[PDB]
glutathione s-transferase
Amino acid sequence: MSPILGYWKIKGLVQPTRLLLEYLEEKYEEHLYERDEGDKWRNKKFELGLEFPNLPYYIDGDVKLTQSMAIIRYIADKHNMLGGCPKERAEISMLEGAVLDIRYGVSRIAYSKDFETLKVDFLSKLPEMLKMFEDRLCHKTYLNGDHVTHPDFMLYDALDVVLYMDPMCLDAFPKLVCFKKRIEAIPQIDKYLKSSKYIAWPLQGWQATFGGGDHPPK
Amino acid sequence: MSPILGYWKIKGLVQPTRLLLEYLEEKYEEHLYERDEGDKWRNKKFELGLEFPNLPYYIDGDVKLTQSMAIIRYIADKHNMLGGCPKERAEISMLEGAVLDIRYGVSRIAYSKDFETLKVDFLSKLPEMLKMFEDRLCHKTYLNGDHVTHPDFMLYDALDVVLYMDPMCLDAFPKLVCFKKRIEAIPQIDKYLKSSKYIAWPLQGWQATFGGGDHPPK
């Protein structure tokens, strides 16, 4: 039957996976845990059949899975989007890891009380990481050419997130700005972002120093 | 000709990749940057042909690569070790990500001046992460059965590293202790660990608050 995706009701780690499932027009069900609901999770945690229990989880009936990169690579694998030969596979994993540098970079420093002095240091590395993708897109429509791969939806969620932290970071990167409007003009993604299912905030878990609460940026 | 692997002369991010190349008896060359040599790196950085310049890099002549998970997945891919069908592939990526939780968990908190109050908090989550692998090995020789996969060499380097941080964390986890002696009894790995090429320290870059310098634990 329909797979289950389970996570906190935040963007977090699972947001690139939802956009991929949306692009692909795949049916899936979500178990969302709200913030008062830690207890729900800790009870179900061990009775779900996961060998490495954690959130997000993905259950299929062929598969019971818990790492967010194992889940989005599996859904893309199932649709033949993962690579092709070792070299194409490795290219897509290098794109994957270069956007995890920007995204887990926000996460490292969110939740520290020192976020504000941490902000300034992260933001001075960010333009060199951004220039690498701006140059990649110089001749491509999507990160690996004319076709959408799962790293495209990971880079859309990282640009969405560093723009709350500094609204001006993409001025200077015009290809990156068009790539963001290009993902939003994909009709399945436009429909989802206007949906009742879209979760616009928080970015991080509700207790972070940046991207938490039920708010406003920085 | 022989591939080049380039990194700082530390264990860091590349240590599971070296043990895999050693298990596999593959020839490779290393460009090691010592600590006074940042400048060397920053000069060569842009003249190497990498689309996403960073350390480690892996050059092949079929491939020029820079994310440490794209490099170790490629060498394993080339030897058919990566998976088999979507489900086997996803299993190996979930193992990958469950040991990156322990390893990038040491890294997050190393380099903070607050490492000491950060230590105590990480160490109280560590036994639940460790129990998941102890239970995985309860009926297996290696993490995915009777055959070594690259996640095995990632879990060996994470157990090596949390044992400098708390020498007693594996007392209670006897399968995990035997798994560590079992990887060291693999003859290619025994030979390498007695080698002139083995880099025993630092664990992190030489400036970290834990695993840095040219030292001693914690």
Observations:
- The CA atoms of residues 20 and 150 of chain A lie 6 Å apart.
- The interface with chain B takes residues 51-54, 62-63, 65-71, 73-74, 77-78, 86-87, 89-91, 93-94, 96-98, 104, 108, 132, 135-136 of chain A (CB under 8 Å).
